[PDB]
Structures are given as structure tokens and as C-alpha cells.
Paper text:
Therefore, MhTHL is compared with other well‐studied β‐ketothiolases (CkTHL from Clostridium kluyveri, ReBktB from Ralstonia eutropha (Cupriavidus necator), EcAtoB from E. coli, and CaTHL from C. acetobutylicum). In addition, we postulate that the properties of thiolases determine the carbon length of the end products and that the high n‐caproate production of M. hexanoica results from its native thiolase.
To determine why the MhTHL‐modified E. coli strain produced n‐caproate, we assessed the structure of MhTHL at a 1.64 Å resolution using its C88S variant crystals soaked in a hexanoyl‐coenzyme A (CoA) solution. MhTHL exhibited the typical topology of a type II biosynthetic thiolase fold with a tetramerization motif (residues 123–142) in the loop domain. Although the crystals were soaked in hexanoyl‐CoA, a deacylated CoA molecule was bound to MhTHL in the mF observed‐DF calculated electron density map. According to the catalytic mechanism of the enzymatic Claisen condensation, the S‐to‐O substituent of the covalent catalyst C88 and the second nucleophile C382 were positioned toward the thiol group of the CoA molecule. The experimental X‐ray diffraction data showed a significant electron density for the carboxylate ion between the main‐chain N atoms of C88S and G384. We theorized that the map position in all chains of the asymmetric unit was occupied by a carboxylate (acetate molecule in the model), owing to the thioesterase activity of the C‐to‐S variant of thiolase. The positioning of the C88S oxygen atom in MhTHL differs from that of the sulfur atom of the corresponding cysteine in other thiolases, with a ≈−37° rotation of the Oγ‐Cβ‐Cα‐N dihedral angle. L87 and V351 in MhTHL and the corresponding L87 and V352 in CkTHL modulated the pocket size to a greater extent than the valine and isoleucine residues in EcAtoB and CaTHL. Accordingly, we suggest that the Leu87 and Val351 residues in MhTHL are key structural features for determining the substrate specificity of biosynthetic thiolases, providing M. hexanoica the ability to produce n‐caproate.
Numbering used by the authors:
A (entry chain B), B (entry chain A), C (entry chain A), D (entry chain B): 0 to 205, 211 to 397
Write the structure that this text describes.
């Protein structure tokens, strides 16, 4: 295991709906809210920060190296280096494990990690404006599809990759809608019971102060879902009611060496034990969590049943159900407060977001299980990434 | 310092000029050429590759997670994961150190690292086409400037940060042009004497085979540079003649553990010793190599004089002269075959590119210096990154 | 004056607001509605139609020669020719006089005239996409401003030409708002009392049937207008409240020789007597009706006092008040049911639209004035055009 | 016949190739060259001008009412009114007959008529930038096709309408290429013999002075043409060698009443006798000249064989051959100096251009035929327009 890496804080913005409450807010701006919050919760002096690593997928028109922009505007000294990564939906979680690597090697004693995404403000592009089209029409490309949600390999939406999982693996419409229903009910109940209150950092729009995850649909019913029309294929199983949302949010965590945390008198929340990534066939990219988790299990000597709580992102109900079946997930310990379907899925953010939700869930009074947590998600182009943690108490 | 990381191969495409010989080729296409070449030169079985990490800055419209596209189309199994990283001009060098970190930690035994950029095919963006402009003009933004060459913090060009270095630190027009002149002459001579022949991997365009760096200008004279008008400020010192080019290329290296290389019968070319990044004031971003190298020296106990050869990227002569002065570079051992001014500067590629040139330079018959190599470059937003190598012989 | 030209029918669509009830409908679609209605009201056999002339300003992206599209989709034989005409806000009125000229000369016995505009669907233009921008930002131009509402000569808005009239000729903010207020009240009352019912041709949207002018604001008060901020200049007088609307509509009339009407058994509604256009200084374009009407008076021997009703388009209250003062209008006989401020101003349509409103107004039971009608409007680039009619009874 | 209308002067710019010699010159700017020249050749005092009427097809991004822009910048007083028309390729010739109508009715004693077109600078548009695309791609529309060269009715290029003429009417490839060959040879010989010298007005590009029609191909051969690949349909007959060019030019004529010309001591060049337009099936829009000419013949009592010279625009060789066959054209009197194929076809200009070429041809010493001239062209959407003249001597 990594032996020297702890999480000392975490924070996420509310999750906005597509063209919703954060439509007038950049990914950088959401990123700043989250990082400022993470720094304050850790009580880390900003001159102890060694690096900032942020996932961000849809970067067109956002300006230079968005991680660096966020850092400079969260009160982090200009002397601290920063870079941005893209592993699509894996981005925010691979940012965390890259940061953990920095600390475990002794290249850093404190790293800010996270992810951000404003899918609302992914722009449109034209490919041939530099040297000209000469004659004939061109395409006005939605970068959220071109550079995000469309499989570059196959030329179809991620939602078709979900239908592939449905076809090949026999995940029925009823199963998908059941998963979707449970996710909404869980998210609604969690919200109403204050389960998200502490982890959320409010976003002030200069004024309106946004505190609530706006994508949850508490009025969701099994019958309502069954009426919906397929979204990606005619006579399909995947709908808008059982696919993840398109959303806007950011999320950040402060990582530290054990020795640095001790020196600053900062209480460690959790250790990071290890991480893994793995590739799969792009056409069934939803399966990525399965080899990613297996690899993580071989590196750590853990098994699925050892985890007290598990976050496996719901990109599509077809995907989430298949992953949970094959890994032998306990659904009473997996995605307990909803996930991508209910809360939403801002793609560069979600990897750090699910780790943040896991951490706060496991930190709650009365959690006296194994104290191990697992986070994993699927990734367009056919990948998965995962991280194991153990709470410190 | 790192004890277990070796470079076993390196390759780069030739470097195209802006809107030049690679205008019809994508970043991803160049990446594939470089990665295939690196793999062939290593003789590494593709099922021994653990991860791919590629730097790439101007990603708008290029499709999903371009490192993954490159891997899949270079014959690497779908099971291998990949991610893309943006540290502007640092990207390709930071990709190398991130990959080294994988191996040093034992998370991987073989990683593909590098970078790629097609500045020619960076698209134009429309910011408010999703929810509408309503009334009134918008901006058609050139992503190469918005997301690349314009300082998001100051809102002026990288060239103006070059002027700032000239203002504050008194690097004169004449000094800038001498540097530029020597760069052009060094590159011309190197290209004529065959110095780049082995490192270059030819690009086939469907048939034309491209084998040569396009951007070098052997006709350059001190008297010609002196007549050029300032490109960034009225009555300025920075000109198209003493500024790096805008360019297209890709570059890749194969890294391995010493153990895996020994297992496979593959001979190491160089050890990676260590790395360092650092931040500076965005307005004088060109100063970034100075703290990055000092931090690297502090981590390794090396000094500038210990290097046999040095690659410090010439983003602008003003910047390069200042860094070399401040670091006490021996110009007979620094940038001996030219650099960004002459060879060109495809921003996401250059960090790996300079390391490949350094490696092949030090590997020439007749070299018998320290066998230590230094690569560093400056970064928009005020950063530097650096790597130290030692040839294996 | 003309001795052989009669109007036998007229129809207009309701007038939509900007991005309003007709946002999903093309100019051509509205044109078809109006032309079909006009043809049905005339009872003219379509094989008796000799030509179609339609005004239309913002034609970008609408396809080929839109008058011809309208004719073909209104059931007019392919054998009938058509052309489109642009005199900005004059277009639809100049279309009428051009058609009258056909008949007076004996080149035609029956012509379809009118105008159409969908300011909502005027597109955005990219100027250098054919041969390339090469490097550097461009402009995404709103064609409604570029090709419509911005003075190409001065490079400022039509609203600023309105300010110029206020500066030079001292039409005060209070005067502007009184005009605007009376316009809104006149239109509200007219619409409520059924005045527009017969002239309007309903628009079916595939089902929604649209029958009502959208833009009127019956809640307008002198006190409300007085609180509005200037829309075109800092510390100006012209506001969104005392300025014409941006709007969508179409309007058509059927013109015939007296001989053909008598042959077909079709009863004439009005004679067209004559027409006139004139130019003025672009910077005070709102003054255009003054020389156009004087030239018309000179050609006809009529005077302002001889008209029973007058339509002088309210492009801006500043402009309308100045014209009415200079021409000695009787405001109890001028714009009696509102005009551009209240009903709205779809620029290529309005010239025909005001003539249709004038015609139906004078045709009301109980009218027993001179039976002479005057229509005129101002034109960007510094023009006016006018038509005089006399009802047949 | 019209009895009171004469042409007192004419002028045209050279005709530029697509993205050629006038690529950096607007339609307005070419228009100004032509109008200034026409005014000077007439020696008409500018305060005797009553109206300006200019054809112009592709008006996107050109600014307000381009006829008015041209007038103001050709030294015509601001008091003179102007409008722009669009009848696609008919535009420039219908402008002439509309102007003649103004004079014959006694509404004007002097009118400037013409046409202009910069097909090079027709821009690209996006249809849904005002209210947004929300999600998914859009189209970047080439307005030269959308609003120009594509049949809006059928959704295919004008070149397909030419293939329709070829299919239905049996105009072979060999016939088309023969027509094309003859057109090039005629144009080359005419140019080389100075036949275009007087009519051309030189265009100074601020410096290079352009005097030559640049589209002519004197190296054209029957064999060369036979090698060319179809341009519009697979296994088609229509090629780039036998279709009109895409081009840039302008052209203007001064018209006057007989009485006004006498008063000013301006010698009339030709009388305009009459005009006609007619519609046809859009799919065979090339046939438009046939009914247009027939109608003109019935109005005038002229027959085809009465014309000393004839201009029938070559939009496509298939079109021109069919029109000439059906009208019984003498090819030794028809298109004697080439036409659309050789000289080019700037669409809003060509209608006035062919009348200008006709007028100068008939004015040459040694032309002592009937003194009657005919001009006619086809029009997308299925129309034709024609004008008859008689030289005065
Ligand atoms: C599926 C998708 C295309 C739908 O997007 P959308 O149409 O913008 O979605 P909306 O939230 O507006 O919902 C669409 C409709 O579905 C219905 N709907 C959605 N969720 C529902 C629910 N829980 N119950 C009932 N109806 C529901 C609604 O009727 C809604 O229309 P309405 O609210 O205007 O009446 C989009 O969410 C998507 O692509 N998701 C996947 C994202 C993804 O691939 N991420 C990466 C994965 S690795
Ligand atoms: C400086 C810059 C704007 C020049 O762009 P450009 O104008 O397209 O450059 P070109 O190579 O076409 O040079 C323009 C002219 O300069 C002249 N020129 C350039 N190098 C010359 C040399 N060595 N000798 C003589 N003249 C030279 C030429 O006249 C050339 O015109 P040409 O086409 O007739 O040869 C651009 O190179 C730039 O922005 N560079 C910096 C990139 C950067 O910031 N990277 C990131 C660093 S962190
Ligand atoms: C003036 C102009 C810029 C206003 O455009 P806009 O801002 O889209 O106009 P809106 O109708 O949305 O008005 C903006 C605000 O003004 C206020 N307003 C407008 N008319 C009002 C009235 N009668 N009473 C009170 N408030 C009024 C409202 O607050 C409105 O906001 P809302 O949406 O909450 O009602 C535009 O109408 C214009 O350019 N007009 C002139 C067109 C022209 O030049 N034509 C050619 C003439 S030759
Ligand atoms: C047919 C059309 C699409 C071709 O446009 P284009 O490809 O840009 O044309 P070019 O002038 O570049 O010629 C294309 C190729 O044809 C060949 N060519 C053209 N004319 C030739 C000739 N006379 N002899 C030999 N080769 C010829 C050339 O090889 C040329 O390629 P190259 O010169 O680079 O070797 C275009 O001219 C067109 O659409 N014309 C019709 C316009 C129209 O419809 N107007 C309205 C009518 S109502």
C-alpha cells in the first residue's frame, strides 16, 4: 500500500443541471469555489502547498491550463506549479491518484487535487476557419459531444455503448429503470436528511447563493420511467431517466504526507491505500470499473466485500448494474446516496466528487464497519479508474 | 533521486511549419507516428506496456482523450490505460516525469510518454452558440491564442511576457538577435551534418514521405534580424525573427524499469534521475526554468556545470538569454543544434522533443563528457519544468 | 398621376415579437401566409398573375430569391416571374410602387406586392471562413445589425440617428415618451375593438393558430417610459420604450389594372395615385419622409391636410414627432392605431403593412373624409419613400 | 415599344476569378468603380441623377442596401434614392429594365442601373446562434451555395439543373464541350484584339491596376475538355470546363430620357425598346430565356433573326446550346466574344455585363446590320429575363 498519503479535507460545489443554475459560471469559477473551500477545511497554510492537479475534460475556450487559473485565484502562491489532466470521466479520480503518487515518492508533502466541468459552457467549434473552406458547407461542432460524450473510436454516443452493455449482457429496461428509481429515491432522501450539507461548498452568483444539487428528481416513479422514450437507439433500453445527467460542478481535496500533517497539527481524515487504471473495449466502455477494481484488489489484497461503502459512478443504469453484478457489490453499501443518474455527472469533476461523497459518508457517526472505501468509474474510449481508502478515525 | 527508471527509446516526427507540410494531419496522427516509432525502436512487446501519458495543449475538436486515441491506433492493446496532460509548453516534459513516477513507485514497469501538437489545426470557437447571443456580435476566437499563446491572467501574448523580460532584465534587441542567429546557424548545420537523421521518424502522407524539419532559416543574418519590425509591442524588441515558431509535431519515448528492461533483453539508453516544476509571475513566465532547475539541482545535488549538454527551450531569445545568464549556462553546451526559434515550438510536443534531441546528441560516438543531461522549458501562466538524465553507455 | 392601378386585396400576418411567437417560422413561411390570404381575398385566378415583387432585407441563409420561393409555395404557377427588393424599411412600400409601375405601363395587368421579415431568424456571419483567418480572432456578426439596423456609413445604430434628430431638432425625451405612450394606447384600443381582425391572416404553426399582434404593451405609462434607461447613448433620450420593436411578419397586396379587375368581376378597394422616394443625410435618416412626401405632393398636387388618414412609420418617437411636426400632420388622423413602437417594425414588411392597415382603416363603415391615404416611412442610409392612395368606395 | 428611354453610357470592371485578383475587394467597391466610370463616360452632372438601382445576389455581411452604399461613394448626392434587387442571375438585367420603366413613366429622367457581385466574399453563416443550438451539431453554411447556386426548391446545384437539360433534351457532352471550346477561343481572340478595351474600367488595388478578364483559358482544347471529370453527377456531362465560372465583377449603365439627353447635349448610344420576364420549371431553370425571349418578341414584333447581335448568357453549355437551338439563334451573331464559360459569371453583375458587351460590340465601326440587340439569361428557381435595344448611331 501507499504508506505516506492522507486526505486532510474535501469540498464540492452543488451540482447544477445542464443550462441550469451555473449556466453563467465557468468551470474555473466552480473550481475556485471548491479549492478555496478545501483549503479552509484543511486549515493548510497556502505556502505549504507543493502542486495543484485538476481534471477537466471540455477545455475549449477556457483559456490556458485551467488548473493554474484555479490555483492563482484560490489564493495559492504563484510559485506553486499546476497542471490539468484529461481521462474523460476518470479525470477527477486520476487527479487524486497522481497527487498521491507525488506524495508517496516524496516529491511533494501537500497537493491539491480535484476536477471541474462546465458542460453548459462547452463551446462550438469550426475546424477549417484557419486556412478556409474554399467552397461548400462545414460543420459547427458541439465540443461536448465531439470531445466528450461521443465515442471517437465508434462515432456514436456513450449512450449507445450503454445499449451495447444492455444487448450483450442482458441488462433489461426494467432493471435499468429500477436502478434509476432507487438512485433518485436515495439522492432525494440523502438531500432531505442533510447528508450532503457538510460536503457542499456554497456558490454565490454575483446575488443568489446556491446550496442545492438541482438535478435530483424526487417525483421519479417506476411507472414514469417506463413511459420514457429511448434516447440513443430506436427500440432502445436507455432513456434520459436511466442515463446520467449532463451537469456542472467542481470538487477538490487536500492531500498531505502523514509527517506534514503531524507537523501542522492537521488531523488526517483517510489514508489513500492505492489506485489502478485499466482499459476495455470502447464499445462497452461501461465495463471499465471491472478490470480497474480487480487490478486494485490484486495490488492491495482487498476484496469487494471488504469495503464498508462503495462509489461506482452511474454513467448509465445498464453500466452500473452490470458492474455491480460482476463485482459482487452489496447494493446496501454501494451508491447509498445516489450517483450520476440522480445527482448528475459533470464529467471532469465526478471522479473527485464520488470520492468526496464517499469520504463524508464514511466519516458520519455510526459508521463502524471495516473503514475501507472504494471509488471507481467508467471512461469513454474504454477505461476505468479506481482508488481505495481507509478512514483514520 | 530515482533509481529504477530508464529510457529505452525515443522518436520524433519532423517539425512542420505553421500551415505547412503537416497542415492536413491531426495532432493524433503525428502522435501515432512517434509512438509507433518509439515502440519499434525499443523492440518492446506491446502487451508489456502498462500506461500511455501524452502532453497535448490545443485539444478543441480533436475528439476524446487524445492520448488514448494515439495508443489504440499505435497497436497498443485496448487493455492499456491512457491519459492526456496539459502544462502548456511543459506538457510533453511533465508527461515524461509523470511516467517516470509510475515506474519509480512500482505501479508500472513500462510507460509510453511524449507529446503532440497541431497548432495549424487548432480550431476557432464560438462561446455562446449553445444558449444564444440573442442580439449583438460575438467573437470568433482562435483557440491557439485563447487556449495557448495568450496569457489568460494578463490578457496579452506570450511575446509580451518576453518584452517584460527585456524591459525588466535588460536583454537587448541585439542580444536577442545574436541568440536567434546562432540558433538558426546551429540548426542548419546540424540538419546538414545528419544530426537529426536517426531521431526523426518519417511521416507518410497519403504518397509523400516527410523527413525534414521545415522551419529552419539558414539564410538568417544579424543584419536581417535587425531590420525586422516588433511583433508584439510598438517600439519593442521581440520579433518573428527572435521568437519561437508556431509548429506541428509529435514525440514519444518508451520508459521502463531497469528490471523489466533486463528481463526483456532491451538495452537502456539513459536513466531519468529526477524532475522538478516551479511557478513564477505569469507576466515574466519566461523565467520559469530558473527556479525549476534550481529546485532540480537542490533535489539531485547536481549543478549547471555538471551537465555535458543542456536543452533550455527557446520560446523567445529574450527569455532564453536571461535563463542561460541566470543559470550560468555554457552556450557551447546549451541548445547546440538550435531550439524553438529555429527548429520550431509545437507547444505540447516540445518538452519531449528537446529531451529526444538531448538523448540522441549525448548518444553520439565521440561524446565523453559527464554523460549528464538537462532539459527545461518555460510555461505560460508562469511555470517551469525540468528533467535530469544520465546516459547509460 | 397613375390612372390604371387599383388595390383589390390586402392581408398581413400578425406581428410577432423578437424571438417570440414566430421564432420557429421563416420569413418565407410568413410571406406564403400573407400571399395566399391576399390571393384568396381578391378571388383572383392564379393564372392571371403576371409578377410577384416582395421586399425583404435580412436575406442571409434564407435560400434563393425569396419572393420566388413565396410565389411557388402560394400556388402561383411556375410560369409567373418574381424578384426580391431591398430598400431597408422602405422595401415593402417600394415593392408596392414598383408593382404599380408595371401595371401603369401596361407590362402587367396583375401583380402581387408586399414584404416579409424574420428578424428573429437573421443569422450570424463569419467573414473570412472561405480563404481563412490564418491567425487571430474574428467577428461573429449579427446580420440583423450588420445588414439591417447599423448605419453602414456612420457605423452606429439607427437609434443613434434617432438621437441625432433629438440633438439637432430638439425633440425632447418627454415628447418622445408622449408619442410612445399614445402609440401603445392607440394600438391596445384598436386591437381590443376588433380593428385589426379583418386585415390579419392567421398563421398556423404545426397545432397552434396565431391571430394576435404580440408586441403591444397596454400597461405602458408616461411614468414608466420616463424611468427607462437610454438604449443607444449615455445620457440619451431614445429608449426601448420610445423606439420601434424588432419583429417578425409579412404582408401582401394584389394590384390590378382597372381593366382586368372589371374583366374578372373583382371590385377595387383603392386606386394607387402616385409614389416618391428621396434621400437625406444618413446620420439623420429619420427625416427621410419629409422630402419623400413633399416630392409626392409636388407630383400629385395633394397637400398633407387633404389626407383622411396617414401612416408615417414610427421607427423612433424622435423621428416620428419631427416628421409629423415638419409635415404639419394632424395627429388625430396620423398613426391612429399605433405603429412601429407598439405594433412593431419587421423591417422588410412594414412598408406594405402600414399600407394594409391604412386601407382597412379607411374602408371602415362610417368613414366619410377625403378618402385620400398617405403612407411613408424612413430608411437607413438616409432615405424616405411614400405612396398616396384614394379609396374607391 | 418604350419610346423615351436611351442608354447614354456603360462600363464594367474586369472579371476576376474565384478567390483571384479581386479576392480582397468587396462587391460595393467593384460597384463604385463601375458607376464612377459610367458617370464619367456619360458626362452626366451628378445632380441630374434621379435614382440608382443595382442588382446584387449574395448580400450577407455586405452591410445596408448595397446600391445606396455604391451611390454615396460614387459622388452621387445623398438626396438621390437607391435600392438593390435580387433576381439571381437576372438581377443586373432586371435592374436595367426597372430603371427604363422609371424613365418611360416620367418618374425619372436619369437612372443609374447595374449589378455587382463578389462571390469570393460571400460569407458563411450559422442559423441558430441567436437562441442557441442547446445540444448537438449545426451547419456552417456557404451562402454562395445556400443563397446562390443551390436550387432551394430541389436541394441540388444549378449544375444538376444543367444535367436535367442534358438528360431530357439530348444535349451531348461533345456538344457541350464544343460550345465551351468555341466560347474560350472567341473570348481569347476578342481580348487579344482589344474588343474589351473600351468597355472595361480599370480597378486599382491599394498598388496594382487590374485591366484584364482573368478567367479566360486560351489554352482550352476539345481534347482537354473531354478528359475532365463531371462536376455535379457521377457519369454526368457537365464539367468545370463547360459550366460557367464563379467570379467577381461589377457593371453600370446610365439611362436617360430622350428629352433629358437632348437638354444636356449627351449623345444617346441605344434606345431600350422593351423587356420581359418569364418563369419555368426550376429543375430546368436553364430554359428560362426561351419564354422570356418569346414574350419579348410578342411585345415588340421582333423575331430572333431580326437581331444583329445577341447575348444569351452561358450559365452552362447544356443550357446555352438548348436555348440557342430552340430560339433559332445564329451562332455567328450570338455570344461572339464568349460568355459565362470563358469570361465568367458574377451572378448579380452578369445581366448588366452582357448588355454592356452587346452595346460596345454593336457600337463598333462596321456594324451596319439591323442595329437591334438582344440580351437574355437564365435564372435559378426557373426564370428568364430579356431586353431588346436598338442602336441610335
Ligand atoms: C440522455 C440525455 C441525452 C438526455 O438529455 P436531455 O434531453 O437534455 O435531458 P433532460 O434532463 O432535459 O430530460 C429529458 C426529458 O426526459 C424526461 N425525464 C428525464 N429524467 C426523468 C425522470 N427521472 N422521470 C421522468 N421523466 C424524466 C423529462 O420529461 C425531460 O423532458 P422535460 O423535463 O422537458 O419534460 C443526456 O442526459 C445524456 O446524454 N446523458 C449521458 C451523459 C453521458 O454520456 N456522460 C458520460 C458518461 S461516461
Ligand atoms: C512571432 C509570430 C507572431 C510570427 O508569426 P508569423 O508572422 O506567422 O511568422 P512567419 O514565420 O510567417 O514570419 C513573418 C515574417 O517574418 C520574417 N522572418 C521570420 N523569421 C525570419 C528570419 N530568420 N530571417 C528573416 N526574416 C524572418 C519573414 O519576412 C516572414 O515573412 P515571410 O513569409 O515572407 O518569410 C509567431 O511566430 C509567434 O507567436 N511565436 C511565438 C509562439 C509562442 O508564444 N509560443 C509559446 C512560447 S511559451
Ligand atoms: C431598442 C431596442 C434595442 C430594444 O431591444 P430589447 O432590449 O430586446 O427590447 P425589449 O422589448 O426586450 O425591451 C427591454 C426592456 O425595456 C422595457 N420596456 C420596453 N418597452 C416598454 C414599455 N412600453 N413600458 C415599459 N417598459 C418597457 C422592459 O423592461 C424590457 O424588459 P422586459 O423583457 O422585462 O419587458 C430594439 O427594440 C431596437 O433596436 N429597436 C429599434 C429597431 C430599429 O432600429 N429599426 C429600424 C428603424 S429605421
Ligand atoms: C463547376 C464549378 C463547381 C467548378 O469550380 P472550381 O472547381 O472552383 O473551378 P476551377 O476554375 O478551379 O476549375 C476546376 C478544375 O477544372 C479544370 N478546368 C476548368 N476549366 C478548364 C478548361 N477550360 N480546360 C481544362 N481544364 C479546365 C482545371 O484542371 C481545374 O483544376 P486546376 O486548374 O487546379 O488544375 C464551378 O465553376 C461552378 O459551380 N460553376 C457554375 C456556377 C453557377 O452555377 N452559376 C449560376 C448559373 S445560373
Amino acid at each position: 500500500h501507499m504508506k505516506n498519503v492522507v486526505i486532510v479535507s474535501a469540498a464540492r460545489t452543488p451540482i447544477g443541471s445542464f443550462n441550469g443554475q451555473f449556466k453563467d459560471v465557468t468551470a474555473v469559477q466552480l473550481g475556485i469555489v471548491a479549492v478555496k473551500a478545501a483549503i479552509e477545511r484543511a486549515k493548510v497554510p497556502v505556502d505549504q502547498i507543493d502542486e495543484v492537479i485538476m481534471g477537466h475534460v471540455l477545455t475549449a475556450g477556457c483559456g490556458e491550463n485551467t488548473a493554474r487559473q484555479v490555483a492563482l485565484h484560490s489564493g495559492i502562491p504563484q510559485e506553486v506549479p499546476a497542471f490539468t489532466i484529461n481521462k474523460l470521466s476518470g479525470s477527477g479520480l486520476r487527479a487524486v491518484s497522481l497527487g498521491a503518487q507525488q506524495i508517496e515518492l516524496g516529491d511533494a508533502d501537500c497537493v491539491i487535487v480535484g476536477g471541474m466541468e462546465s458542460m453548459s459552457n462547452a463551446p462550438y467549434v469550426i475546424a477549417k476557419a484557419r486556412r478556409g473552406y474554399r467552397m461548400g458547407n462545414g460543420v459547427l461542432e458541439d465540443t461536448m459531444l465531439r470531445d466528450g460524450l461521443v465515442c471517437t473510436e465508434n462515432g456514436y454516443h456513450m449512450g449507445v455503448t450503454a445499449e451495447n452493455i444492455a444487448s450483450r449482457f442482458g441488462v433489461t429496461r426494467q432493471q435499468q429503470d429500477e436502478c434509476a428509481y432507487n438512485s433518485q429515491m436515495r439522492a432525494a432522501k440523502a438531500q432531505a436528511e442533510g447528508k450532503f450539507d457538510a460536503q457542499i461548498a456554497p456558490v454565490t452568483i454575483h446575488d443568489i447563493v446556491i446550496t442545492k444539487d438541482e438535478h435530483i428528481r424526487p417525483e421519479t416513479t417506476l411507472e414514469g420511467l417506463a413511459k420514457l422514450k429511448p434516447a440513443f437507439t430506436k427500440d432502445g433500453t436507455v432513456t434520459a431517466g436511466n442515463a446520467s445527467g449532463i451537469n456542472d460542478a467542481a470538487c477538490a481535496l487536500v492531500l498531505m504526507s502523514k509527517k506534514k500533517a503531524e507537523e501542522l497539527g492537521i488531523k488526517p481524515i483517510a489514508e489513500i491505500l492505492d489506485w489502478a487504471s485499466a482499459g476495455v473495449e470502447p464499445a462497452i466502455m461501461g465495463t471499465g470499473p471491472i478490470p480497474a477494481c480487480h487490478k486494485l484488489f490484486k495490488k492491495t489484497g482487498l476484496k469487494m466485500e471488504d469495503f464498508e461503502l462503495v462509489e461506482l459512478n452511474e454513467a448509465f443504469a445498464a453500466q452500473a448494474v452490470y458492474c455491480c453484478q460482476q463485482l459482487g457489490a452489496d447494493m446496501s453499501k454501494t451508491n447509498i446516496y445516489g450517483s450520476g443518474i440522480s445527482l448528475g455527472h459533470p464529467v471532469g469533476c465526478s471522479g473527485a466528487r464520488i470520492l468526496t461523497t464517499l469520504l463524508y459518508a464514511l466519516a458520519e457517526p455510526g459508521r463502524n464497519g471495516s473503514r475501507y472505501g472504494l471509488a471507481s468509474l467508467c471512461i469513454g474510449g474504454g477505461q476505468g479508474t479506481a482508488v481505495a481508502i481507509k478512514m483514520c478515525l
